[PDB]
Amino acid sequence: MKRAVITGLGIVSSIGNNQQEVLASLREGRSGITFSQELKDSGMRSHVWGNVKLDTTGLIDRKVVRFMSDASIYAFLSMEQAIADAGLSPEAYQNNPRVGLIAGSGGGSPRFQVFGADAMRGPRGLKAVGPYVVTKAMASGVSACLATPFKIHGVNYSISSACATSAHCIGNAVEQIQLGKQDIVFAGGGEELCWEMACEFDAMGALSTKYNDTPEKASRTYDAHRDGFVIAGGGGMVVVEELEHALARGAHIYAEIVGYGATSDGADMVAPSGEGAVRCMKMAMHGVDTPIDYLNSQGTSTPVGDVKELAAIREVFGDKSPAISATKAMTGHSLGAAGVQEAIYSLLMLEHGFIAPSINIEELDEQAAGLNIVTETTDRELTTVMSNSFGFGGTNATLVMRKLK
């Protein structure tokens, strides 16, 4: 069947506002985590986050940004970058039935959802709400807010699966290409950063709370003293294109998506089973005869989550343990945006031939001994890489990408 490759990428993350800034942060093991006065004032125990260091005001047409929440803004900016990076002129992707968009978020917009309710209960009622809350608060906000302005005529919808959200978006994009239904599918996601949603995770005990005085050390995947993830926001978008189409226009190809796994744990609600993850990685490796040179793990930085994934990786590769690093130690967990941003970090490592370090590991977890966890930036010729996205609700996605000759 049809082959799918990545020909462009765009990103707005806690460690950079474009792929160049991100590249630098990755090589330097630079943290994007900072202290959040907003989270502290909300009454939360976790006072750190991976915020986007950019004032988006005026970066998007007023008539367009009026319908958007932060998730949409981040994804929109990421898509602009992706389009330019892919070298696509407007005439090349706009008003084209074979060009689509699949992008979502983990929670839509709790901020505007609460805003509407707060305004409605106020002295002005509906007048305070406004006619833009729906497009900001709906779960499909990210796809709706981008498909319209970019004149997308092909597939258009959002996929939601918590931490696996944008990973499933990319995989679904691949499926469209494989089915011969689309030539190009923009895939990715975005996530707003707000106490409204963050407090829900803190109320679960899923967020780090013992390192508020040293924010850059809070996210410490695989460290013996990890205590939860650090919430983050941002966006990302990649251009998934059918091979012949990309080659025909002389597109720059980062890699071919040679594997996509999507499975379900069917066990616990908010706790990885590990078993589902093993099946997910094996599914993504079907037909892939080249070894995995680097694995960008889910690596949430949670006590139980980290160990479950470690076990799954051991079961899948056994003696074939590849280089492993959890970029979340640097970036925080962007939820709905994580899958696409992490695929992008993996693509940058593959393109520039280096492995980003898994930082803040002062004491490697006992259940990690024997694995090749990279803790220092290492230059190496990579050919095949894997990125795992295992999210709450027992939903799993794995992407395997490989360089073309």
Add this chain to the structure above:
Amino acid sequence: MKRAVITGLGIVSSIGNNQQEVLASLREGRSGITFSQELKDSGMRSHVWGNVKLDTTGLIDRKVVRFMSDASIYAFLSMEQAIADAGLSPEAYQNNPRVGLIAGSGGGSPRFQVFGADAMRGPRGLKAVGPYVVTKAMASGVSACLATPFKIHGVNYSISSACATSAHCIGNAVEQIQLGKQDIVFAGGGEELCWEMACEFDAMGALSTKYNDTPEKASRTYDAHRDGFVIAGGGGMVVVEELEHALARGAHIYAEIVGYGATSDGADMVAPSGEGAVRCMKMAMHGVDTPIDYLNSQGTSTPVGDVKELAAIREVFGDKSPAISATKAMTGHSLGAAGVQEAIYSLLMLEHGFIAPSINIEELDEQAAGLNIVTETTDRELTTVMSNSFGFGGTNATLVMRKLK
């Protein structure tokens, strides 16, 4: 490729808590719209809705329902119904890598989103929020809350696309079967009914407000005096299964999904373009050598909305227009659940050989001139039906189902 058929269904709507009750309401053109004190007390202009008349108290185990929002509850109950109706037992669908679940909601759970914010802002903070808000508030709540209890091991995620949400879910399930990845995929969705979310649509001027005195007449699709849709809640689930697998176990086959259309308008944020709908319908009809006997249109019952679809239908068929009926006139708009529920209504009509009436039409709009709009329950031998789902963001989905030879 592989063929996909529906072997079971389940539904919880404003006009029936199961397919039997729904079937009864459809034949008599009964309305599920009622006066809502909740919507009035909130300060909204629209005081009518399509509530689910059912006491779900104790219908779901404690340990399971504690993670669910109303959208998940309705979806869960619909899935139980679907499993039984399909003749499936745990040994056949549980812990099975080839059985998946694709279901979502349009807005997740505004109610628990606001609940978490309200509780957090209280003196108790995190303690008042509780550790169950995430699974209720997240956009993937519907898929996560069902996949776990039903021990689903295959694909697991939610698709969101406003009014087309559950229609795209069914289409994606078909794709999984065509790709040979799954033998069975439960597809559908759910939507809660609350002022929290309802006020967003009212502030947008999309909800009917000139009939709060005569609820059962508020929703009046294709009527010259329409003034917005009536918000509704509920759930739906269908069992999508690979043909040979279904025949092998002697399952009851309602129909085969012979067409699935998915397009994008890339024009306006909250207004159909028509151009996109036309392409969507043609996409679903492509390859279908059999004519469409019945069409369950979007029929939102909005001034511009209704006009656009009719024009699109006229453009697709023209002089050869099939029987058309807007079930939302009696059921309302269940948003994320509308796609699967309307697919089910179309299946019941196809299964029992009859056409549901388009109630509340005193004066047919001039736009529906050369079209066959059924306003009375008519008995006919249907073979091929079509269901259109066009939501905000310019996202379109069309399903074509036909009896099996």
